[PDB]
Amino acid sequence: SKYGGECSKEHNTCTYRKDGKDHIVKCPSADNKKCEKDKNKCEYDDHHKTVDCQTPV
Length: 57
Ligand SMILES: [Cl-]
Ligand SMILES: [Cl-]
Hints:
By secondary structure, this protein is mainly beta. Strand 1 and strand 2 form a beta hairpin.
C-alpha cells in the first residue's frame, strides 16, 4: 500500500512507481513533509491517502 519514489525540490513533487507506471503528485507544503532535498525518497501511501517527501531514512 506504500509506493516509493523520488522528489523534485524545484516543483515540490513526488514521482512514484505504482502498478508499472510513474505518477507525479504534489508533495505537501508542510515543513517536515515537503521536498527539501532534490531527489530525496518520497512515498505515496494509498491506504492512508497521504504523501511525504521526507520519508524516514
Ligand atoms: Cl508510465
Ligand atoms: Cl498529503
